[PDB]
Write a protein that binds this DNA or RNA. Structure first.
Ligand SMILES: [K+]
Ligand SMILES: [K+]
Ligand SMILES: [K+]
Lengths: 91, 91
RNA sequence: GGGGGCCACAGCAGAAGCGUUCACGUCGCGGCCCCUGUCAGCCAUUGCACUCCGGCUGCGAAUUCUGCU
RNA sequence: GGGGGCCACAGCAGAAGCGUUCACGUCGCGGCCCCUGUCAGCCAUUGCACUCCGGCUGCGAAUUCUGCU
């Protein structure tokens, strides 16, 4: 069940928000245009990120190519987001 | 063998040199005048400190009173210094 | 960093030395507390969101002198 | 933050913002590459000194303009 948005967890929770978004953008921008990267460090949402790609093909390539990739010395676990991100559902 | 200088190890190695010196001074100056606090973060000397008291009785009181005291969530391990500090030997 | 409370202290002006600062100028530099943005340490969390928001603890910078009343 | 290399850049005058800053004013805010203070993540280290000094990885302060010539 592919999706425009990939769900990444098992992220290093010590990395700050602005730095985590910039590093996630640096390693995921080669798969295609990124519309947004959503990161929160609250108890519920820490260690996780949502990367919204402009095209589902980019998300599929990113999920297959970056699965288990070490990122701040922790392997990224990548799934498709279970539901459409708000911006995707509105366009 | 009460020495002017107490040797403290099992110290939190993530604490930076200036903060470690100020915090060690806050709890040990209660026991008497401190002549110097020697802290190095090199591989050999990290997690350790030398607190030099002006009088030997202060070092004995500081040792008996602060043995095992939680310090940055690690129990302080205090001994007398095996040899005199350079500044004490020259006095 | 911010906001209050005690206990000092005759006022105003000035010089220098410091503190903060890439540096310079303004500014600030008596003791003890309390509250609070950030930051750090430890604990807890493997969590599917479109969002301020887990807990505890700690850091909370810097004095001499000279005029006038 | 600093030190270098390679290109790009006409002067005067302003407005807003940003960066550095306890906060203002001065100052600074084009691109790429290399080295590096610091900082951060991971790994290793329980160590008796009077001192630069373990390894690897990452970030690398800040502007679009605006008129006149
Ligand atoms: K974790
Ligand atoms: K996160
Ligand atoms: K140390």
């Amino acid at each position: 069940r592919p999706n425009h948005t990939i769900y990444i967890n098992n992220l290093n929770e010590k990395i700050k928000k602005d730095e985590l978004k910039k590093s996630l953008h640096a390693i995921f921008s080669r798969f295609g245009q990124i519309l947004d990267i959503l990161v929160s460090r609250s108890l519920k949402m820490r260690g996780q990120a949502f990367v919204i790609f402009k095209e589902v093909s980019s998300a599929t390539n990113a999920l297959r190519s970056m699965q288990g990739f070490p990122f701040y010395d922790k392997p990224m676990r990548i799934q498709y987001a279970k539901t459409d991100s708000d911006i995707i559902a509105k366009m």
